[PDB]
Design a protein around this ligand. Structure first.
Ligand SMILES: [Ca+2]
Ligand SMILES: [Ca+2]
Length: 95
């Protein structure tokens, strides 16, 4: 299994600041984060449940699972996440 997909999410917060959800600041009052499908900021390079190889494949446990940016919103509902852009990467699969 390969787990190279991720989402770059640009958002604002009705309460709190970007670091509270493991995000960076993106210009005054904006935040940005890269997430796996579980709606949590990436811990690494790839979105395996456990380690992948350098290609992002042969991922132990397969991929992290979830509802992508919608799960990021739900997990962090106490901050009131206002998504302004979502970009799913890569844009296509090799071949
Ligand atoms: Ca598969
Ligand atoms: Ca859903």
């Amino acid at each position: 299994e390969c787990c190279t997909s991720r989402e770059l999410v640009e958002f604002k917060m009705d309460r709190g600041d970007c670091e509270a959800v493991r995000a960076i600041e993106n210009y005054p009052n904006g935040c940005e984060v890269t997430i796996c499908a579980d709606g949590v900021a990436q811990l690494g390079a790839y979105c395996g449940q456990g380690p992948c190889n350098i290609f992002g494949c042969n991922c132990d446990g397969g991929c992290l699972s979830g509802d992508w940016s919608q799960e990021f919103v739900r997990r962090n509902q106490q901050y009131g996440i206002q998504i302004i852009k979502v970009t799913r990467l890569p844009f296509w699969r090799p071949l």
